[PDB]
């Protein structure tokens, strides 16, 4: 009774998340196919993702529950096809900004993928089935990244013929999405807690830490292309993106394996590993070597996933399943307001229009000021 909706939803999650072209994006955008200057990608186009995701977050969250979760999963599958049709044939800077907007829909509509299962499976088969659907997303993007490198290296496949595989993959994803059973109840429509000392405190580090994480991962392929232009030397983006994704998975798994009370060791473990994020972000900035810049990416992604797991674990210790949605929905919206303010001032063309060379001296220092504030907050 639970195996059909999960098999169809896991197949959609696997095929929609398998996109070999993702690691080779800036190499593709700033190439002979859609030759676009680095300053045009970082300061004009990319900011449009956080602006559009911010606006299309509350409406889609309320829409996902009003109409059932299935209608919005089909919408995400369409936005996948539109994004990769423009990413293949669309030309110019203004078309790439539309691609940024449509990817904000793709990222804003994934709420219905994980929220769908709760309304179609029994409560007991929820944590197990929620794990199956989350792990198939990691296996798909870690296998897809490995496929990208194994072709670009041992087969000399053009970046253009990696978006064709990405388009073919998400086109199949929007074939199972039409076959999922339609839910017969939502969480809120058809179905004060922040006062706790822990929940508000733990939500602030989550909201602030994740906002910087999204900012760092945003302009990271631009940094790699700056330290080693893709048209001059070999670039191992696919192998690096796969190992970093795999490394982050083990960091999250290890957090739940060791049984250590996250109250006498909960705040300290978030300052020690937040310092590691800052230390790993200055290395990516101050090093002329591309291998040391790859290693800094591994440590940043692995280290961050080791705390978002601890922050999430502590947040969700007394809340119901119904209160996860509207507590993790606010935190994801606060993190976007933080990200938008940082993007407007730092990266946006109308703001400071800082290049990617100096940007990581800001992101690295951003994580160093969160550690001090959460270490200087212990005042006596």
């Amino acid at each position, epitope marked *: 009774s639970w195996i059909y909706p999960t098999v169809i939803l896991c197949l959609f999650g696997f095929f929609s998340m398998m996109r070999p072209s993702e690691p080779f994006l800036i190499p593709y955008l700033s190439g002979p196919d*859609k*030759q*676009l*200057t680095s*300053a*045009e990608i970082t300061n004009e186009i990319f900011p449009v993702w956080t602006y559009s995701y911010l606006v299309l977050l509350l409406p889609v969250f309320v829409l996902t529950d009003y109409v059932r979760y299935k209608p919005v999963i089909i919408l995400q599958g369409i936005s996948f096809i539109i994004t990769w049709l*423009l990413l293949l*044939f*669309g*030309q*110019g*800077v*203004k*078309t790439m900004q*539309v691609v940024e907007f449509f990817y904000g829909m793709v990222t804003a509509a994934e709420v219905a993928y994980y929220a769908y299962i709760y309304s179609v499976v029994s409560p007991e088969h929820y944590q197990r089935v929620s794990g199956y659907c989350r792990s198939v997303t990691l296996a798909a993007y870690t296998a897809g990244s490995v496929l990208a490198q194994l072709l670009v290296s041992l087969a000399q496949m053009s970046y253009f013929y990696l978006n064709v595989i990405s388009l073919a993959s998400v086109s199949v994803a929007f074939l199972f999405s039409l076959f999922l059973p339609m839910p017969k109840k939502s969480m809120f429509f058809h179905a004060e807690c922040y006062s706790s000392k822990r929940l508000f405190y733990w939500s602030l580090w989550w909201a602030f830490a994740t906002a910087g994480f999204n900012q760092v991962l945003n302009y990271v392929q631009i940094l790699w292309d700056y330290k080693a232009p893709s048209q001059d030397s070999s670039i191992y983006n696919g192998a690096v993106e796969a190992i970093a994704t795999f490394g982050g998975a083990v960091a999250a798994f290890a957090v739940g394996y060791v049984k250590v009370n996250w109250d006498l060791l909960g705040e300290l473990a978030l300052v020690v590993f937040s310092v590691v994020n800052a230390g790993s972000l200055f290395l990516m900035h101050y090093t002329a070597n591309i291998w040391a810049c790859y290693a800094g990416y591994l440590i940043f992604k692995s280290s961050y996933m080791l705390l978002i797991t601890i922050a999430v674990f502590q947040i969700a210790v007394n809340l119901n399943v119904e209160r996860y949605a509207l507590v993790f929905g606010i935190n994801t919206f606060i993190a976007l307001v933080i990200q938008t303010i940082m993007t407007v001032i730092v990266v946006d063309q109308r703001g400071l229009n800082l290049p990617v060379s100096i940007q990581f001296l800001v992101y690295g220092s951003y994580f160093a000021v969160i550690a001090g504030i959460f270490l200087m907050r212990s005042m006596y």
Partner: nanobody, 122 residues
Framework: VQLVESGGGLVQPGDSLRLSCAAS????????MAWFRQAPGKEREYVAQ????????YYAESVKGRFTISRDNAKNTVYLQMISLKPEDTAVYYC????????????????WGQGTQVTVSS
């Protein structure tokens, strides 16, 4: 837009050359212009790029440091000043405008110029 070039010719080594590009006809929607190069028995080669609304420039590594691309919106012309020429530069230099809008196409550059001849030799 109808891009017509000027300023080509034969110049010894060490002499300069300024090339113009008078865009006209639908000049209202231009957001980037570039210069390309096609040496004899070769393919088109990127040489430079200038943004219209702003002024941000972008040069090919080989030609950087002696090529300078500037806009003159007032008259809608685009220039390319080339210094310290050597006999390995001789080519046909083309304009390329990326006019604007949401478009599907194979090249970022919609319209192209006729070409201007640079014959560096002695």
């Amino acid at each position: 837009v109808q891009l017509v070039e000027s300023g080509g010719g034969l110049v010894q080594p060490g002499d300069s050359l300024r090339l113009s590009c008078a865009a006209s006809g639908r000049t209202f929607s231009i957001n980037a212009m570039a210069w390309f190069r096609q040496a004899p028995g070769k393919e088109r080669e990127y040489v430079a790029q200038i943004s219209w609304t702003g002024g941000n420039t972008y040069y090919a590594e080989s030609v950087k440091g002696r090529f300078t691309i500037s806009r003159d919106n007032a008259k809608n012309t685009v220039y390319l000043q080339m210094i310290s020429l050597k006999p390995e530069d001789t080519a046909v230099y083309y304009c390329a405008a990326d006019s604007g809008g949401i478009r599907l196409g194979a090249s970022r550059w919609n319209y192209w110029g006729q070409g201007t001849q640079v014959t560096v030799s002695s």
